[PDB]
């Protein structure tokens, strides 16, 4: 009975749901040549979180726990804690801790630590290799490559803050990260579990509409494109509103609030993704004050006006 809606926020006022950075732009392109199955930024229109999705954008791609030095290296194993420092529970029916990275790549940031007895602190450059055989956040373990073999203490609270991505070469620039390749959450040769499903346009002439950011790059020639299916603020809003879906497809209009002019229309599917009627790769040109407006629940045969 509660009416459905989407927030009155512009694209630039919103946040990527797959990495803690603002949205920049809207992009559409074909996606039949890869699997689109991100686990962050997944939520139904009536407020059910999916995959590894949680509510605040600052927790995405962060890790916390205690660390142990890996002998012969400058690397450390982190034994993951919950976000609130309670024990991690590996038995919950999720793919990995909520907010775990959902792509294969090298995420560079800073590993910080506080010694509880005197409040002394330290911080070091650190990279997590989410395509590594030993990356196993579902089992409670990840490793960080750092610039020290001696400075981090055992049994002291340690945090990783993500900054950006790196690339170390290949046959071409921009060969990594691979934003549509899921990690193996329990390490090499394991089954991922409890995934949010892959998404694809089912209606002829339609493509996914992506909410796009550019991840900072920290070294090399990385592919910094990062597309999410829902802004983080839409996840937060649907969770809060929990308005029942009256059909499987919500018709949205993208509107200029100064003129009331509709720039394009699109479909917001109840399971939490957007499609437009377009063929090809296209960067949308929008007024910066434009926003999305829910206009009607529609049936399964609605043809959108060309984007």
């Amino acid at each position, epitope marked *: 009975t509660k009416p459905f809606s989407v927030p009155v926020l512009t694209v630039e006022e919103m946040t990527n749901s797959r990495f803690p950075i603002p949205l920049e732009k809207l992009f559409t392109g074909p996606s039949s040549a890869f699997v689109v199955q991100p686990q962050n930024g997944r939520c139904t229109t009536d407020g059910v979180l999916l995959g590894t999705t949680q509510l605040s954008p600052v927790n995405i791609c962060t890790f916390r726990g205690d660390v142990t030095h890996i002998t*012969g*290296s400058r*690397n450390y194993t982190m034994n993951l804690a919950s976000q609130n420092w309670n024990d991690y529970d590996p038995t919950e029916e999720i793919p990995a801790p909520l907010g775990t990275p959902d792509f294969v790549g090298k995420i560079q940031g800073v590993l910080t630590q506080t010694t509880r007895t005197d409040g002394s602190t330290r911080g070091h450059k650190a*990279t997590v*290799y989410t*395509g*590594s*055989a*030993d990356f196993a956040p579902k089992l409670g373990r990840v*490793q960080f*490559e750092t610039d020290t073999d001696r400075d981090f203490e055992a049994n002291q609270n340690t945090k990783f803050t993500p900054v950006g991505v790196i*690339q*170390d*070469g*290949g*046959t*071409t620039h921009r*060969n*990594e990260p691979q934003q549509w390749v899921l990690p193996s959450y329990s390490g*090499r040769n394991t089954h991922n579990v409890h995934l949010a499903p892959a998404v694809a346009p089912t209606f002829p002439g339609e493509q996914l509409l992506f909410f796009r950011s550019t991840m900072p790059g920290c*070294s*090399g*020639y990385p592919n910094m494109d990062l597309d999410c299916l829902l802004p983080q603020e839409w996840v937060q809003y649907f969770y809060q509103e929990a308005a029942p879906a009256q059909s499987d497809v919500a018709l949205l209009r993208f509107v200029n609030p100064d003129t009331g002019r509709v720039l394009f229309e699109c479909k917001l599917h109840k399971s939490g993704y957007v499609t437009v009627a377009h063929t090809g790769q296209h960067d949308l040109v929008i007024p910066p004050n434009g926003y999305f407006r829910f206009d009607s629940w529609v049936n399964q045969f609605y043809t959108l006006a060309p984007m």
Partner: nanobody
Framework: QVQLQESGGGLVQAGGSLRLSCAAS????????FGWYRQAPGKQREWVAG???????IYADFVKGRFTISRDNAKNTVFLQMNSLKPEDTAVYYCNRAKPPTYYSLEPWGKGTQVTVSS
């Protein structure tokens, strides 16, 4: 768990040869693809050569037939035979698990091995 250990670097004169070795453990060596990479001070790290589990090879544009990557599954070792060396090849060289077809690396790095080519 994964370990990568390079050896065989050294100082050589322009036009000389080196043979690099890389000992890899912690994986199923025979099903992995491997790559060689290099980085000089103040420059970006770059890929040099790759080899599939089938022992097919592929090289960066600057190799120009002078280097040969190979593998010995029996010994869990990858090799880079380096001929006709030039000063532009000076760098720390590293081996890693790699993902074909573009050969991005997968693991934290080993210590690498220094190659220095005098003019």
């Amino acid at each position: 768990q994964v370990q990568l250990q390079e050896s065989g670097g050294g100082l050589v004169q322009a036009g000389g040869s080196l043979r690099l070795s890389c000992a890899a453990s912690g994986t199923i060596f025979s099903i992995d693809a491997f790559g060689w990479y290099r980085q000089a001070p103040g420059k970006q790290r770059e890929w040099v050569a790759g080899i599939t589990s089938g022992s097919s090879t592929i090289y960066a544009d600057f190799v120009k037939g002078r280097f040969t990557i190979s593998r010995d599954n029996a010994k869990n070792t990858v090799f880079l035979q380096m001929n006709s060396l030039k000063p532009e090849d000076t760098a720390v060289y590293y081996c890693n698990r790699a993902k074909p077809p573009t050969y991005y690396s997968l693991e934290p790095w080993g210590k690498g091995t220094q190659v220095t080519v005098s003019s």
